[PDB]
C-alpha cells in the first residue's frame, strides 16, 4: 500500500533528455558520435511508457541550468514522477555543457523536496551517461542511474550508441510492464557487464569492461504502470 509510489496520477511525468553531441573547441572535448542513437532510443522508450519527452540538443552549461530551473518551477501536481536523462562528457559529479562543466548537484538541487513542492514524495530519476573520473530528508526520493562506477570511464559506440543507454532501453522495453525499476536496472547492470568489451587503438581505453552503478534514495518501489 505504502509500498509502491502512486503512479496513477493523470500523467506519468516529464522525461527531459539533454543530448550533448557537439562541444566548443575550447573545452578540448570531442564530438560524441553515437549519442543521437541514444537520444532517439530513449525518446521512443519513454514515449511508450507514457512520459512527455522533451529532447534538448547541444545545451551550454547556462542553458542546462536554466532548463532545469524552469522545469523545476512547473506545476507537477498531476504528474507521477520526473525523469532527466543526461548524455554528455563528464567527470565525477560533473556533466559537460557544450561550453564547459556543470556541477550535477546544481542541476538536482532544483528538485529537492523543499524546492519543488509538486514533486515532493514522488520519484525523481536522473539517468546519466557520462564518465566519472575522480519533514523529509532533502535527498529522499532520488534515484541516480549512473552508466558506470565511481572513478571509471563510460563507453559509447559511434554506430550503436552507449552501452548503458542501449541496454537500459532494451530492458525497459522488455520488462517495464512487469518488473520493479531496481530489478530492471539490475538486468541493465548484468547486460552491460557481460555483453560489452571496449575496442580502442589507445591501450588506455582498450579491452575494458564497464559496470553501471545504481544509487537509490527511493523510499518506495517504482513500477511504470498502475
Amino acid at each position: 500500500a505504502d509500498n509502491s509510489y502512486k503512479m496513477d496520477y493523470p500523467e506519468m511525468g516529464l522525461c527531459i533528455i539533454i543530448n550533448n553531441k557537439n562541444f566548443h573547441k575550447s573545452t578540448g572535448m570531442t564530438s560524441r558520435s553515437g549519442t543521437d542513437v541514444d537520444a532517439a532510443n530513449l525518446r521512443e522508450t519513454f514515449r511508450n511508457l507514457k512520459y512527455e519527452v522533451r529532447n534538448k540538443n547541444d545545451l551550454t552549461r547556462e542553458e542546462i541550468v536554466e532548463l532545469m530551473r524552469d522545469v523545476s518551477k512547473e506545476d507537477h501536481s498531476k504528474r507521477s514522477s520526473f525523469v532527466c536523462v543526461l548524455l554528455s562528457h563528464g567527470e565525477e559529479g560533473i556533466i559537460f555543457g557544450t561550453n564547459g562543466p556543470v556541477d550535477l548537484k546544481k542541476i538536482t538541487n532544483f528538485f529537492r523536496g523543499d524546492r519543488c513542492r509538486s514533486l515532493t514524495g514522488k520519484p525523481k530519476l536522473f539517468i546519466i551517461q557520462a564518465c566519472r573520473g575522480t519533514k523529509i530528508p532533502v535527498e529522499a526520493d532520488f534515484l541516480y542511474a549512473y552508466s558506470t562506477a565511481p572513478g571509471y570511464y563510460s563507453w559509447r559506440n559511434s554506430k550503436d550508441g552507449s552501452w548503458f543507454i542501449q541496454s537500459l532501453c532494451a530492458m525497459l522495453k522488455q520488462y517495464a510492464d512487469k518488473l520493479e525499476f531496481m530489478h530492471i536496472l539490475t538486468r541493465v547492470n548484468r547486460k552491460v557487464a557481460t555483453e560489452f568489451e571496449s575496442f580502442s587503438f589507445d591501450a588506455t581505453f582498450h579491452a575494458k569492461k564497464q559496470i553501471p552503478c545504481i544509487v537509490s534514495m527511493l523510499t518506495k518501489e517504482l513500477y511504470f504502470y498502475h
Binding site: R32, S147, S162, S200, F205
Partner: peptide
Amino acid sequence: DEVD
C-alpha cells in the same frame, strides 16, 4: 568505441 569512445569514452565519455
